[PDB]
Amino acid sequence: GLSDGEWQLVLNVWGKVEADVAGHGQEVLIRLFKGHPETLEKFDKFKHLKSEDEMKASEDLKKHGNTVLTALGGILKKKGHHEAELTPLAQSHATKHKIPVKYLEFISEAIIQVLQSKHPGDFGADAQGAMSKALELFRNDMAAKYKELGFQG
């Protein structure tokens, strides 16, 4: 539900993420886990990470962060017409990983926080608003797919 101008601002700051996907992904997950400690309970692989230093050293955390942002990038680049990319994610997140829409809100927050911390100059008022909207569109379409699949939106 974004304008063309809004999608442009989204893809322009996403260009910064594409210059270092894994570093941004790492920071996103660390911000998610430190901010909302309960999210860490969905990851049986990361149950032994007892501090930010342990999270920073984990090669599997950094690879997962890379996987997450690569996928989200794929979705953002479709500017709304992302059904084919969104479906498999909604399927796996509603069924196997058991990820509530609320945790999608927490990771959306962490994405924004990381963009703001790393690119303060490039992530101004207009780019922040546009990115909020894009993440909201993503959460809303994930939620609608979850409901169609028989789960809580």
Binding-site annotation, residues for nitrite: 64
Token pair, residue 137, equals 């569109």
Q: Which of 104, 114, 134, 143 binds ligand HEM (CB under 6 A)?
A: 104
CA nearest to 111, candidates 145, 138, 81: 138
Cα torsion 5, 19, 28, 101 to 10°: value is 40
Query: Which residues, numbered 114-153, are part of the site for ligand HEM (CB under 6 A)?
Result: none
5 versus 152: smaller Cβ distance to ligand HEM: 152
* Amino acid (1-letter code) at residue 102: K
Determine, following the binding rule CB under 6 A, whether residue 107 of this chain makes contact with ligand HEM.
yes
Site string for ligand HEM, 42-71 (x = CB under 6 A): xx-x---------------------xx--x
Q: Which of 77, 80, 101, 103 binds ligand HEM (CB under 6 A)?
A: 103
Angle (nearest 5°) at CA 65 between 62 and 68: 155
* Amino acid (1-letter code) at residue 37: P
5 versus 147: smaller Cβ distance to ligand HEM: 147
103 versus 151: smaller Cβ distance to ligand HEM: 103
CA nearest to 2, candidates 57, 60, 103, 78: 78
Cα torsion 4, 6, 12, 18 to 10°: value is -100
Which spans of this chain sit near ligand HEM (rule: CB under 6 A)?
39, 42-43, 45, 67-68, 71-72, 89, 92-93, 97, 99, 103-104, 107
